[PDB]
Ligand binder design. Structure first.
Ligand code: COA
Ligand code: COA
Ligand code: COA
Ligand code: COA
Ligand code: 5LQ
Ligand code: 5LQ
Ligand code: 5LQ
Ligand code: 5LQ
Lengths: 396, 396, 396, 396
């Protein structure tokens, strides 16, 4: 069984594998558009001999991390092993080859969205963002006296067809992704794809609409089977006024009983309402997963909380080296050392800490990171925290 | 219609109101035991004239807040208005009288568990702890290689009948409540009540068992209707070893498909498992609500994060005064001032910040607290944070 | 196989049959209390030979019919055929013997509640009252500006324990049953039974409460499994003020999401609310069934609408004779004749018309009553109508 | 914000509002066909300034009322306010302008189908017809010995494709609508629309079939998801024979478990069967709502029951004048007066009485109409009753 970069003749077989392997494959046309983000040598296949029995690739992405720093990021995707060739070491072989190519190419981090929670930790990936579904019974929803934008005049939100305001969505999203940890650059082809999904499909999803504000937008559609549920596919807002104004509009959808959205744990929505319980958490799950490819480059590139005072420690990553880590004035220096470790963790744990979604203290309580210094734990919690709460851009 | 402290002859009428008003009233015998925590003059009734059409009381509690400081706390409970006398201002009249008595008695804070999320904010109460239900499909659950207590020998957890180990539970819980923000002292009568609920009831709840470790315990029972679900009513652990050891035992319940528990958002359980997704969040809700009765006494009594450097600001509470607030070396000083406010919020918002469960930044994003200084927001977030994550002791 | 009046030694066998035959037999103690309403010779049994394989009886009841006239009525009940002796003509034999005894005793009507809708029509019984379940989502319920009793003062409804106000319920119900078609006298033993069912049962129904007004009462309990549903078992009101006042109280049950009641199609409740749709009809079914034993006595005893002008016709009942029927000034005369019939119907159809619940026009449209005179249909509709809407007293 | 009659350029914006506002908008093509019934100046829009944030219109309809009298009727429809502009008085402004145009144009009544039960009462609309869903478990259904058309020969019903017998459906429906209170003239464009909906849609509704009798038809289709349920979309019959014959055919659908239909409370179907319970009422709701624009013209145009003897009274409508009302020989005279009122009601209440669906007595019991004369109530009940039961034609 051989492993190599696929040629053009391999792709019909790869699409076949994908169609049969994923729960709901996006299809050849969509995947070809996404493929424009895959660099030369960014893909591997495994052939039996000869049909394709395995595949995996990465895309070139730009990920925003705390301190508004943007890192080149390898986004793994299109990963499959044929049902006929399970438990043969094929995933391990493909991941190791891609990680070698990703490291040699100069990516400081790789990332992915996990199909199952138990597979990727052993390859050094830790979950780094958290998805929260909120479901609002809008029949009871009333805005608090303090909520922005409820004076006495015209409304700032418009209600439009998505495809006729492409430029404004692009510009709003671009501002959002640059300021939020977890943000991803969305190139033109992904806007093509997004707007194609906005149209209704015969025996499919219903037509999408948009609520448009100068500093934010929401895209929504009525659920296909529950016609009293509106699903917000995406809501991006760069000011509190825009966020509140958009939610006022959504709660104005008097045909609906419920509005649902996939958002993050620090979404201010529940505090916008007189009854905070009306914004029910109906689902919670890991979002973006991260593998730190180069520890010192990743740790030095990120900004850190100014509130914590300067401190130094020694960090060992289980098979990623040992480093003298000094954090102060919101910056880190991270240099090689053979001095005794004060903190130890597996590589995946560092990825889970990296964007601020998980506290070092909490990971210590599970013994996923080891130290005999509780003061150091407190300092790590505070330093790795993010002023702007971590969010999930889009699935890939 | 008159309002006064009830006499012994008022109580049969009060129990009648309670039986008809609550969703599932705990009954006269239980409520009489809880009543031993209600001080003289801690209860009010409203009579029509003459039957009882309204009631409310508070109990004397001890609440642990960040920095392991224990505050006397008035716990409101047994609040009802007759269905025949709604919208007549009776709740407002009872709350105002009790708050006057609570303030004059010297309580710096009052607290409650809300029957509905939309009622108590206008009386100055903000939700201050967060309840998380986790449901674990234990059939797939495997512990991570790093998880504590999986060497090669005997187990540290015992499996016992609750009533035969009362002393050990008391002692473990006492250690827990003193070190955790949100902890409440549990007096003898509440242990009597807890252990009475451990026994099976004909056509009722099934018998409870316990898993006992030197540094932690879990109480559980099989669900009454779903016999493949075990419900953990309470799990208290003072070391990571005890917490992990108890979960190993619970996942050892091979008769069950699922184990559920009401816990907090920072429970390390998901990180104990190879697949973090198996610990599903099935429910989320506000737990303990807080009203700060005396702003400067509450703010000075609490410990604050050492990591943030000394800073000063001016805080106005909407009808609770304006104060010069200086925080440094983990302590606050909070004195009267007429200088211009830098931060403004309603009283309920301060309660939501007080134990560390909600970030000032997040509340600012909802306009529930107003300031024109983002640096100050960052400093408040960091200072009000709690080293030990906030938890909910028991419902009242 | 023999048929006869049972002796005291037959009753243990009869209770056994009942326990095994009914869906949820009320039990020996309850049935013994109801048995006090069964006259000497009011019961029949069938023995195999010798065990009891069949039984049926009637009770002595007082039924109110239009014009506030009270008729002695034979209430059939406790009817069973052993599963081992089906399709052997046993029901037909028992019904014919009881009907002979009922007719010879001088009852002008018999009545029953049907376990299945398809059994009793062929024995001359027609459904004569209609049951309507209304379910009110009380969270949205607001009373119309016109609704009685919403001024500015004390409430007229009290909230009490049922057993402590037995006399007031008795007196309110007695007034109700005498003025409403379908009303039944409720003797002392049935009040004993009713109040016994008001208490909670271990692994059973929850405790009942009452809302008491000078001119009406409601008895309710929380559902055993859905703790957000209150079931009104009985609501009896003699003035519009009492009816509205009681519903104001019920909608004041803020612990509940929904209030349900078994009522009648003309219940004014939906018109009491600003949104008439909130009172949802969740169930509809035949209630009391009637067999007219003596046509001329039943037709002459009833009062008729004054609005229709005097008219005469000839009515044939398929095996109950032919009569000259003259209606005027709210009274009927009904005498033997051999003149040609203008209207024909089966006996069961006349029972369905008798209390005003079903229109002659509607029955004609199904060909259940035959005439070649549409003017006569209009006159029958109007004459048999009841000023006071027909209701169902209690099940037997 | 301005209100005016829309120009052709306003309609793309109006269709956008409609697509986003309704639960399941019928779409631009269908709505354009319905628009042919909207007269010049029958539509209003509200612009923000400028996009369309509000709209409403009326169609020219012909409504049959008791006594087979046909009234020109303004049918309100296509009513929407943008979710961005709620609670700004826009609905009230549009309704008042349309009602002014409707009144000045000479319509004696307006009508609508309500999207929610709580909105239209305050604009003078009362619910005037009642919809009843019946669900028949046809596996048990047997016709009564009396039911028409069960002799010994050929059947009168045919089973056909709807589009090939358009003329016969038109002619049957035309006869029906002229004789039934609630009937509406169905012009050609609505027959085009109806027959277009008869065809199957890919990932949509299944194909419709018809059962055709000389004096009646039924249109039905199998449910999209429950393939054992047949839904009768429309059944119109002008004789009892046709009605029964069509139901015999429907119960002949041996592939189905259940047949459902939206019908009216006096549908004779349950009396056609040996077990009347098999026709279960699974749903009940208000149908057509009515606003009487001109009280004396509406009251004089309607026919009244001949059975009641001549009587006179004085009726006040709360903001619609006071009139001397005299009813006799099936006709009313209704003239201005300043004499003391004997009956008072809001305008919406009169609409609810107008077609005979609701009894004055029942509305009095809710205090929605006030009088101190019970004899007068009885006379109003009898006079406003309809010989032919009130039905609902089609939704708009
Ligand atoms: C999981 C996966 C790719 C199959 O891989 P595979 O070739 O069977 O895995 P390998 O043979 O390389 O196994 C290597 C190790 O991983 C483990 N492993 C891999 N998949 C596993 C699974 N589903 N369950 C349990 N263990 C698994 C093996 O037990 C093995 O352990 P070992 O090292 O102790 O022997 C396959 O289930 C799949 O298609 N997943 C979809 C991935 C995805 O969608 N990713 C998101 C981007 S598209
Ligand atoms: C809520 C409550 C006590 C009823 O109180 P009430 O006497 O009707 O309230 P009041 O008449 O004092 O109303 C005062 C204000 O509160 C508001 N309010 C109170 N309960 C409300 C409810 N359920 N919904 C909406 N508003 C409410 C009123 O609108 C009013 O507003 P205003 O000041 O603008 O006029 C009752 O529903 C209840 O029994 N709640 C249970 C409380 C509980 O269990 N607490 C936990 C400890 S046991
Ligand atoms: C229905 C019943 C009593 C059984 O009676 P049975 O002895 O089998 O009936 P018979 O043998 O006398 O049958 C006589 C006729 O009734 C019909 N019949 C009786 N019960 C029937 C049923 N459940 N289904 C269909 N037909 C039935 C027979 O077909 C027969 O028709 P025929 O005259 O054309 O031959 C039995 O099912 C029962 O226990 N019902 C409960 C009644 C009840 O609860 N009443 C309310 C007061 S407690
Ligand atoms: C209801 C409706 C049109 C929104 O209207 P709106 O512009 O917000 O209403 P207005 O601002 O004119 O409000 C006027 C009054 O009506 C009341 N009102 C209107 N809609 C209401 C609702 N959904 N709930 C509660 N009250 C409402 C307001 O409280 C206000 O009361 P006030 O006079 O005491 O202040 C909107 O929900 C809708 O689109 N409905 C669909 C109507 C429909 O489909 N009709 C059938 C033919 S298509
Ligand atoms: C963008 C994309 C794919 C892709 C990307 C780049 C190149 C190519 Cl040829 C294809 S995909 O593998 O086809 N599926 C995709 N998105 C949907 C899959 C999301 N997963 C996340 C993990 O939980 C299951 C669903
Ligand atoms: C301890 C207690 C009560 C009590 C307390 C002190 C004195 C007396 Cl006389 C009674 S209680 O009001 O009867 N109900 C109680 N616990 C259950 C109620 C919990 N609520 C919290 C809010 O969501 C609804 C359930
Ligand atoms: C009052 C009574 C009974 C009774 C009456 C008189 C004398 C004796 Cl010994 C018993 S019973 O037959 O036991 N069941 C009874 N009520 C419940 C049955 C109601 N039926 C009505 C039809 O749908 C099934 C339930
Ligand atoms: C006929 C029609 C419309 C119509 C009518 C005239 C002109 C025009 Cl441009 C459109 S509609 O508003 O688009 N929706 C319609 N029927 C379906 C809506 C029925 N409502 C009734 C109330 O409960 C919600 C559904």
């Amino acid at each position: 069984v051989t492993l190599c970069s696929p040629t053009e003749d391999d792709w019909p077989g790869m699409f076949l594998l994908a169609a049969a392997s994923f729960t709901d494959f996006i299809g050849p046309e969509s995947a070809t558009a996404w493929r424009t983000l895959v660099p030369t040598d960014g893909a591997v296949v495994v052939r039996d001999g000869s049909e394709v029995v395995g595949m995996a690739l990465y895309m070139d992405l730009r990920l925003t991390v705390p301190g508004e720093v943007v890192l080149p990021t390898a986004g793994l995707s299109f990963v499959a092993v044929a049902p006929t060739h399970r438990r043969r070491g094929l995933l391990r072989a493909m991941c190791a080859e891609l990680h070698r190519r990703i490291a040699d190419s100069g990516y400081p981090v790789a990332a992915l969205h996990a199909s199952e929670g138990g597979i990727y930790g052993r390859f050094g990936y830790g979950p780094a963002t958290t998805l929260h579904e909120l479901t609002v019974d809008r029949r009871f929803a009333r805005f608090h006296a303090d909520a922005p934008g409820g004076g006495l005049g015209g409304s700032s939100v418009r209600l439009v067809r998505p495809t006729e305001h492409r430029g404004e969505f692009e510009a709003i999203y671009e501002r959002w992704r640059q300021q939020v940890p977890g943000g991803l650059l969305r190139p033109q082809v992904l806007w093509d794809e997004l707007l194609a999904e906005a149209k209704a499909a015969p025996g499919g999803d219903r037509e999408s609409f948009a609520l448009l504000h100068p500093d934010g937008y929401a895209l929504y559609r009525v659920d296909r089977t529950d016609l009293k549920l509106a699903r917000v596919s995406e809501l991006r807002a760069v000011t509190a006024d825009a966020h509140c104004a958009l939610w006022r509009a959504l709660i104005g959808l008097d045909s609906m009983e419920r509005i649902s959205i996939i958002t993050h744990p620090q979404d201010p929505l529940p505090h916008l309402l007189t009854d905070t319980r009306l914004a029910r958490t109906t689902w919670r799950q890991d979002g973006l997963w991260l593998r730190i490819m180069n520890v010192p480059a990743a740790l030095e590139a990120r900004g850190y909380a100014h509130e914590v005072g300067e401190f130094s420690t020694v960090l060992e990553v289980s098979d990623g080296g040992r480093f003298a880590l000094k954090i102060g004035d919101g910056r880190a220096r991270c240099t090689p050392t053979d001095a005794a470790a004060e903190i130890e963790m597996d590589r995946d744990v560092l990825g889970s800490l990296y964007l601020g979604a998980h506290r070092a203290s909490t990971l210590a309580a599970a013994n996923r990171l080891r130290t005999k210094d509780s003061q150091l734990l407190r300092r790590l919690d505070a330093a790795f925290a993010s002023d702007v709460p971590v969010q999930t851009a889009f699935e890939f």
